[PDB]
Design a protein around this ligand. Sequence first.
Ligand code: HEM
Ligand code: HEM
Ligand SMILES: Cc1cc(N)nc2cc(-c3ccc(CN)cc3)ccc12
Ligand SMILES: Cc1cc(N)nc2cc(-c3ccc(CN)cc3)ccc12
Ligand SMILES: C[C@H](O)[C@H](O)[C@H]1CNc2nc(N)[nH]c(=O)c2N1
Ligand SMILES: C[C@H](O)[C@H](O)[C@H]1CNc2nc(N)[nH]c(=O)c2N1
Ligand SMILES: [Zn+2]
Lengths: 409, 414
Amino acid sequence: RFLKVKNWETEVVLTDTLHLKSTLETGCTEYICMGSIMHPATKDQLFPLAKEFIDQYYSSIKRFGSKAHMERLEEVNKEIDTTSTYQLKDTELIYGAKHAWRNASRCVGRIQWSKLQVFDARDCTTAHGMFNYICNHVKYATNKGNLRSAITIFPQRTDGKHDFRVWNSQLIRYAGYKQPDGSTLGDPANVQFTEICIQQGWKPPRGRFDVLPLLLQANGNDPELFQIPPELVLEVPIRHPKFEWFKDLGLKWYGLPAVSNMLLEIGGLEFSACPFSGWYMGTEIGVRDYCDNSRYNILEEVAKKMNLDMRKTSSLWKDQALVEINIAVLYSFQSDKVTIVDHHSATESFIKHMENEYRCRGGCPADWVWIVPPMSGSITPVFHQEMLNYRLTPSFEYQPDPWNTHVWK
Amino acid sequence: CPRFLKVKNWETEVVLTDTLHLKSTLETGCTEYICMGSIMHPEDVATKDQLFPLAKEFIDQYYSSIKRFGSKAHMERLEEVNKEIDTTSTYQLKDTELIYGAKHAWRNASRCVGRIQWSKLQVFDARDCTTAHGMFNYICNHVKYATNKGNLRSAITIFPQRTDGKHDFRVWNSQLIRYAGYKQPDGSTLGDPANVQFTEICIQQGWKPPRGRFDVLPLLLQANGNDPELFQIPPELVLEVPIRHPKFEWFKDLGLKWYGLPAVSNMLLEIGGLEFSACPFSGWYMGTEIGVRDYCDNSRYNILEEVAKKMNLDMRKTSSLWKDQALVEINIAVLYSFQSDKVTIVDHHSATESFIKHMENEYRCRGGCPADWVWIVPPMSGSITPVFHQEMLNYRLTPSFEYQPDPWNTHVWK
Ligand code: HEM
Ligand code: HEM
Ligand SMILES: Cc1cc(N)nc2cc(-c3ccc(CN)cc3)ccc12
Ligand SMILES: Cc1cc(N)nc2cc(-c3ccc(CN)cc3)ccc12
Ligand SMILES: C[C@H](O)[C@H](O)[C@H]1CNc2nc(N)[nH]c(=O)c2N1
Ligand SMILES: C[C@H](O)[C@H](O)[C@H]1CNc2nc(N)[nH]c(=O)c2N1
Ligand SMILES: [Zn+2]
């Protein structure tokens, strides 16, 4: 049955028919909602999954039931029969990748989904080759600050014993170190991965913003360390348009957000290595990266320099320091002409994007809990926007951290 | 379902195990293939057969709570209720049961961040009420008691339950205390835009509006299914706070003020299958309720722009975050004004911190705590409050507070 979503600010009402095409589960039941939970093949299973994907591909290019469509199905069935798997055509690969992004309920940036540069790395066989592909990705995506969305797709999972994995959670991240006393130098989110690198032979500068090495795993072998050429890593020193002391905090960040630990699923096939990149919404750095307790935690230091009253919470000193930090981040990127979007602008685009999708697609899966920005929620248009969440394929999925699964040789 | 459900806090890595969801009663609106957790809203009267098991379930729960489950008293109460349903098709709650039910409707309110206080709730029994004048009397006493000269005390007043659905008691007001909103011919709105509809209804019922920015609405009260009647709440019973700012001298020049007592009156209380259509209840405010939503919402007082102008922020780029900056100062002002005037209020950092402690305790001692993340997380600065990183489970336990249609949509005029 059709479902309605209402915007309470504008009273605009959209009708969802798209959810009727979903097949994967949300995590919820009729009795319990799990909307705030972060994480709620064989020949036999594979072909219908493949058949489904091939179907909507040919439906997308308006050639459903064509001879070419029929033949492709017959070709895929025979190939699963003989080899227990199948390979995607280049067109299918690109379509599948764009629609995995399109279907990403938690991404507020999806108005861009069809502008995605797809790099086909399924011929890769070694970690050295993975390194090369990734360098090319980073260079292309960065584009001297005029960032471009991209995804590099490495060979699909075979028997599960020969997975390609990027062990980094992002291509570019700063190191974190457990200090002797107990605190943390650098980025606390990355303390474990940093130690994994150090064990593998990485010589840490033990600085505050050390770019981590790539830890790359090809065909199920032991992962190998590589250093991204520094000239490929674009960074932005964070300063504030009024507070001239803000630069004295010695903060900077990287311009390219590039998530590398997720799994891309297309027509039953699993791509365990598929780093993808876009550009930042300011809050991702300014709110989460800098102000989470389990992160850089600079709220105190900034509020002190703003000489704010920090004894009582009701002075909202945390709230004030937060806005200023996020002003600094936006101002810094824009001044260095590195692509960035503020949460007001991003959330506006998303409402516009939703309207588009309801119009041409009959819906848009959207995770309110993740779509609403981590600051100033209700003065953004998405706060008052009702959303329906459901799981469409092709999709990006979570997967276990490889150091929990890998058997070292 | 399985017997155990785990939730994680991603900031502290604390994990909690929920068994209480097994007692869940109604549908959530979600299914296996769709989540509706951001949907605001995902005659009637129960029959003898429908009522029997619902009352039994509640009476069982009550006697379980006072450690007398299976006792002679438990069994006699069950038999008494059963016979009363059999021969009257309804039943009456004992005072103890009524008080227990009301407290637990609040305890079970998944959208409420303030539930650490749930056991401290003054329950006013108004089931002897027969007329709108009497409703007015009970409601005045509620306001005076709850307000306590600024030392607010949470309270609920419960009017007679529903019978045949044609004799409902209703408070037509959405809250006991709200400001009027007036639509102007030129398209603009004076006062509170959120209340324009109810204001017009009052004006049609006979109310003479002062037509100001902060006119307290009259009470519109329906007893026993009769046409509603208008009453003016004694002005001295309405505690208000002028909003000023601890640094900005000019903030007072905005002429803003708000009322101290948040008292919601359009919800339905459901206990053991009985339905109390008029059950006004009140607590004290979280600042953002007034400072973010009431003031800064576009379809509300919308002073963000004017505050920004007096702060001389660049308002041409959104990326200057002039809105964000203004919003903070506004909420600073609200909190400062209330505290200075010794009127009870809580900032979002305190409330969310208290709620986390509450939730943990509930998981520990009750086996869970239904919570709606979408409502629990505050409308500003979400990620720097401890609830943002806390996974939650939402499900519906009874007794409960429910939504119900606005009474003008269904009322048969005499
Ligand atoms: C082009 C600019 C983009 C912007 C501004 C943007 C913005 C965002 C933001 C703010 C989040 C929440 C991140 C967090 O809080 O951790 C997010 C999540 C996500 N994005 Fe986008 N994004 C962009 C491009 C992309 C691209 C190119 C892809 C894939 C091809 C993508 C796929 C995803 C996925 C899969 C998630 C959430 C993963 C999960 O937790 O399930 N995004 N995005
Ligand atoms: C004691 C101080 C209290 C505080 C600080 C508090 C705080 C809040 C807040 C901030 C909300 C969200 C409101 C909104 O965003 O519009 C809320 C909702 C709610 N509260 Fe509380 N509350 C308190 C007392 C109470 C009491 C005494 C009751 C009932 C006995 C109650 C029942 C509810 C219910 C049923 C909702 C959500 C209603 C819905 O589903 O829309 N609360 N509370
Ligand atoms: C492609 C892209 C762009 C962007 N601005 N942010 C992302 C953020 C994520 C992301 C990052 C981290 C997590 C879990 N901490 C969940 C999602 C993934 C991709 C992103
Ligand atoms: C008892 C109590 C205290 C408080 N501070 N806020 C409430 C807020 C509500 C509430 C207010 C508004 C809405 C829908 N706009 C839904 C629930 C209900 C009760 C409250
Ligand atoms: C669309 C969305 O569900 C709606 O605007 C909700 C979101 N969360 C909320 N949370 C609270 N506390 N109060 C609200 O009014 C809302 N509004
Ligand atoms: C518990 C909760 O689901 C978790 O902290 C989520 C909430 N919403 C989020 N939203 C975004 N965009 N990013 C996040 O990491 C989170 N964290
Ligand atoms: Zn759900």
